[PDB]
Amino acid sequence: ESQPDPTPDELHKSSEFTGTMGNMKYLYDDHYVSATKVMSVDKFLAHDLIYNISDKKLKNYDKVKTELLNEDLAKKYKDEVVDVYGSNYYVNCYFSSKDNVGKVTGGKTCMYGGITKHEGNHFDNGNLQNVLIRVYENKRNTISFEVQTDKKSVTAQELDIKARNFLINKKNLYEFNSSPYETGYIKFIENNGNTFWYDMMPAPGDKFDQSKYLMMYNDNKTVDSKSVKIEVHLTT
Ligand SMILES: [Zn+2]
Ligand SMILES: [Zn+2]
Hints:
CATH class of the largest domain: Alpha Beta
Name: enterotoxin type C-2
Keywords: superantigen, toxin, enterotoxin, zinc-binding site
Oligomer: monomer
Entry title: identification of a secondary zinc-binding site in staphylococcal enterotoxin C2: implications for superantigen recognition
Assembly: monomeric
Strand order of the largest sheet: 8-7-13-10-11
Distance between the termini: 31 Å
PDB class: toxin
Bound molecules: zinc ion
């Protein structure tokens, strides 16, 4: 069983968000944690995994905590060599640390999901997979573009991040104060017909909780990059 399309009344409307859209833009504008062939070295709470990942670019962190849907998922990846890709946040990000030759025995940055096994998850000959994104504006297919990934089974999160990064730079998806769009959702259609979507707009109100918004990625949902179909539905 897949997820039914969004009803008219459940989609978040940007006009109803009176906070600063820049806080949403932040999460997707050339913003992401990426690591290759790493293994967790610790755990804060039962549902999370701690990794030693330092962004050689900007160097804002050396420790990354990613929270999963439950202990079973965490245990599945805990001792495997994995690849990581996701959107991180700092506000309300906390977890005690104990190590040396790094930070002051403290945390650094947080995220949800974003984990894929490294072994057997890449294409031969170092090929990259192009994934097509069809964008619909007011029920009209205005533009289509491609994003790439080197993973066979990639997290929906990675594809979502790359799709929004493009849209932010090419269509001003999110601006500092607001957005030119009223509603927007990204829909994934799998080869087996299964479908699911994420609301691209912040919940109504004057504040945006980045931690709460990103939590949707904690299911570590992955899709076959070779066959998945993606659609972005926007309205002005
Ligand atoms: Zn649990
Ligand atoms: Zn890999």
